[PDB]
Design a binder for this molecule. Structure first.
Ligand SMILES: C[C@]1(c2cc(NC(=O)c3cnc(OCF)cn3)ccc2F)N=C(N)SC[C@H]1c1ccccc1
Length: 374
């Protein structure tokens, strides 16, 4: 507990291409780089020579492979993958020293799934059974890990932005990875990592919307998404306020919609003109909340000095992607059904402002901020 030297820095990636951990599948062990995804629940790996791939799972080489003789078809709006379900022995070399029999979806056809130029060849879905494909009977990797070993029902993520790195601490918390205190928000329901936003501020100025709008139709913590995604009505309000606070320089309308990049001369980026963004989350106690605050260093991300505005509209509710997660050490405390936030020791800041986790605050009717099907 508290110190996990061997797991520090077990994550790498390229900007906008996600955060991956090294994993082994089969006997003898086949090494693969696997994207860490808190927004899905399948362990799914390339199993065929797709041209984008550095390597792939070769089931014929593994003596411990067991065929489940079942297909799986996984469409999304963003793209698709399909595969063949089986089990095999899985371990994480720079994680806990254990071997687990886990479900593996062997990917045999895909579209807009793998990224051309990326260094990963699979996905680790870290969310709950309820959103696993084809159904909730397919046990997720982390569920198998906890059931079969003595690894505690907890993991934490420190994602470090602006070639990227970070840590996945499996089974615990490393105190060197954060400054100040952890503050916990309850996991509303165990499917996605669902949370409730109770208040939103831009430079400490309340957006003054019905808090139900902030969570329409849900709010989730998702390492497999880049942007801070906000529901349409919230996005419009937030951008209006962001435009106002930054109005000392005018930018084209397309920039705020992510249709254009904006550029400055090397080293001259005017961070000071861009507001901080605060999300208040439901606390552990009745009428008690806490606030997480991110900088422009989190929401304006380098494209390679040119930047993309990485807050965008959603029809799937709030998505707290890498834009949020790069500011914070995030503790997915599955055993206590809660998520902890603390200021990340690796978050990108300047001499004037840092990311913040602050509380307690007094907020009434926080339960009403949750959305239910009418
Ligand atoms: C399953 C899925 C998914 C996500 C990613 N993500 C990334 O590439 C990525 C890139 N940058 C990030 O931060 C900054 F580095 C974070 N992540 C890659 C493949 C992938 F399957 N997970 C979701 N939670 S939402 C779309 C969904 C999806 C499903 C099918 C096709 C495409 C995406």
């Amino acid at each position: 507990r508290g110190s996990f030297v061997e797991m520090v820095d077990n994550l790498r990636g390229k900007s906008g291409q996600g955060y991956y951990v090294e994993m082994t599948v089969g006997s003898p062990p086949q090494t693969l780089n696997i994207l860490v995804d808190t927004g899905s629940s399948n362990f799914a790996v390339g199993a065929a020579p797709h041209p984008f791939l550095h390597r792939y799972y070769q089931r014929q080489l593994s003596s411990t492979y067991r065929d489940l003789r079942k297909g799986v078809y996984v469409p999304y709006t963003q793209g698709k993958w399909e595969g063949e379900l089986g089990t095999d022995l899985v371990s994480i070399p720079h994680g806990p020293n254990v071997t687990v029999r886990a479900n593996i979806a062997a990917i045999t056809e895909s579209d807009k799934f793998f990224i051309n130029g990326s260094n990963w060849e699979g996905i680790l879905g870290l969310a709950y059974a309820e959103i696993a494909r084809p159904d909730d009977s397919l046990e997720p990797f982390f569920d198998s890990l906890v059931k079969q070993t003595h690894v505690p029902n907890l993991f934490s993520l420190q994602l470090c932005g602006a070639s990227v790195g970070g840590s996945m601490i499996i089974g615990g918390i490393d105190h060197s990875l954060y400054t100040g205190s952890l503050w916990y928000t309850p996991i509303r329901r165990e499917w996605y990592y669902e949370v409730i936003i109770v208040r939103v501020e831009i430079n400490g100025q309340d957006l003054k919307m019905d808090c139900k709008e902030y969570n329409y139709d849900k709010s989730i913590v998702d390492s497999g998404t880049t942007n801070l995604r906000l529901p349409k009505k919230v996005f419009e309000a937030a951008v209006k306020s962001i435009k106002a606070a930054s109005s000392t320089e005018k930018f084209p309308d397309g920039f705020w919609l992510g249709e254009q990049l904006v550029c400055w001369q090397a080293g001259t980026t005017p961070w000071n003109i861009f507001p901080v963004i605060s999300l208040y989350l439901m606390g552990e106690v009745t009428n008690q909340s806490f606030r997480i605050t991110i900088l422009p260093q989190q929401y304006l991300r380098p494209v390679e000095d040119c930047y993309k505005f990485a807050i965008s509209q959603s029809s799937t509710g709030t998505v707290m992607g890498a834009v949020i997660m790069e500011g914070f050490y995030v503790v997915f405390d599955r055993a206590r059904k809660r998520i902890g936030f603390a200021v990340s020791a690796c978050h990108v800041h300047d001499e004037f402002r840092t990311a913040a986790v602050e509380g307690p605050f007094v907020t009434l009717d926080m339960e009403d901020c949750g959305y239910n099907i009418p």
